[PDB]
Amino acid sequence: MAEAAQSVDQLIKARGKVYFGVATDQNRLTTGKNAAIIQADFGMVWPENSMQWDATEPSQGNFNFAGADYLVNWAQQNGKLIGGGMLVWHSQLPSWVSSITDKNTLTNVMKNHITTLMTRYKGKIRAWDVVGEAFNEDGSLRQTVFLNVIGEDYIPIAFQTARAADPNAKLYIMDYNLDSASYPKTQAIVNRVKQWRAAGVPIDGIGSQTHLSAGQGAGVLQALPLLASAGTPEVSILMLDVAGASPTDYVNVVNACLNVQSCVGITVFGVADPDSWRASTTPLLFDGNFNPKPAYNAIVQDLQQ
C-alpha cells in the first residue's frame, strides 16, 4: 500500500543544499512507518526531546544519554546526518538549574552541560542548537534563569564553550516567530547576532523555528533574506510545520531557502500528521496513513532540475 515517491532530501542536495531533515526520537522510530519514511525521504534527523536538559541531566552531574544514544546510533546505522539540542533553553529545564542564583555557579553548570553533551558525540553531529528561544516578542532578551543570573554574557559564553567542545559542529542560535521581516523580533535577532559576531561570538547559524499558520509561507520569502543579513555562515528552517499543509505555503518556504545562499536546509517537525503537536491542523507532509500529502509532492515538483 506504500505509495511511489521521490526523496526531497536527494532533490534538495541536487539543488545545492545540505539536507532535508526531520525531527524524531526513539518512540517514533519504533512505530508506524516513521523509520521507513525517514530512510527513504529525509537525510538528517534531530532529537525532538532526547537531548533536552531535562532528559540528559536530570540532576547536576548525573547524565542520561540512553535516548540520545538511540537516535545517534540509528542515524549512523542509517546513513543520516544528526542535529542536536537544545543545549541552553528555559523550557524543559530541571528545577535544580532554576534553583541556582550564583553567577559563577550557573556559568560552570551551563558550560559543563554544553561540553559533556557535545564531547560525547564529537565529530558526529552536523549542528547544535546552542541557545534557543532567547528573545521576547518585542526583541528584548527573554528573562530566563540564564539571563537573570549570568546576564547577557551567557550567550557569548555558551557559544565559546561549544566551539571548544566540538570545533567541527555548526553552532546555531534558534528562535520562533521569525517568519515576517516586519516583526520586531526578526529585526532584533539580526541586530544582536551582528553585534555578537563583532564581539567574536562563534554563532555559525540562525535557525528559524517556522511554525506557520495558513498563508504565512509567503512571508518567509522576505524574513529569511533578512535573517541572512546578520552575516552568519548559515541559516536554516527548523521545526517546520504549516496549519493546513497547503502546497503553496510549503513551496514558498522551500523557495525561501533556495533563494538564500547561506540557507543549508530545511527540517520538518515530524513525519505524520497524527503525531504533531498541532495534529488537528494536519500540518506535516505525510498523512495518518504515512502517505505523502499534496504538499510533499508539490515540494518534489518544485525541486526537480
Residue numbers in the entry: -1 to 303
Q: What did the published study say regarding this structure?
A:
Here, we investigate the molecular origins of the nearly billionfold rate enhancement achieved by directed evolution of the computationally designed Kemp eliminase HG3 (7). All HG3 variants have an inactive conformational sub-state, rooted in the original protein scaffold, which was gradually supplanted with a catalytically competent sub-state as evolution progressed.
K50Q increased HG3 activity only 1.5-fold, in marked contrast to the 40-fold loss in efficiency seen when Gln50 was reverted to Lys in HG3.17 (22). The maximum likelihood X-ray structure of HG3 K50Q shows that the Gln50 side chain is properly oriented to hydrogen-bond with the TSA, but it shows significant disorder in the ensemble refinement, as do Asp127 and adjacent residues. Similarly, M84C provides no catalytic benefit to HG3 on its own. Together, however, these two mutations boost catalytic efficiency substantially, increasing the rate of the chemical step ~30-fold and overall catalytic efficiency 10-fold.
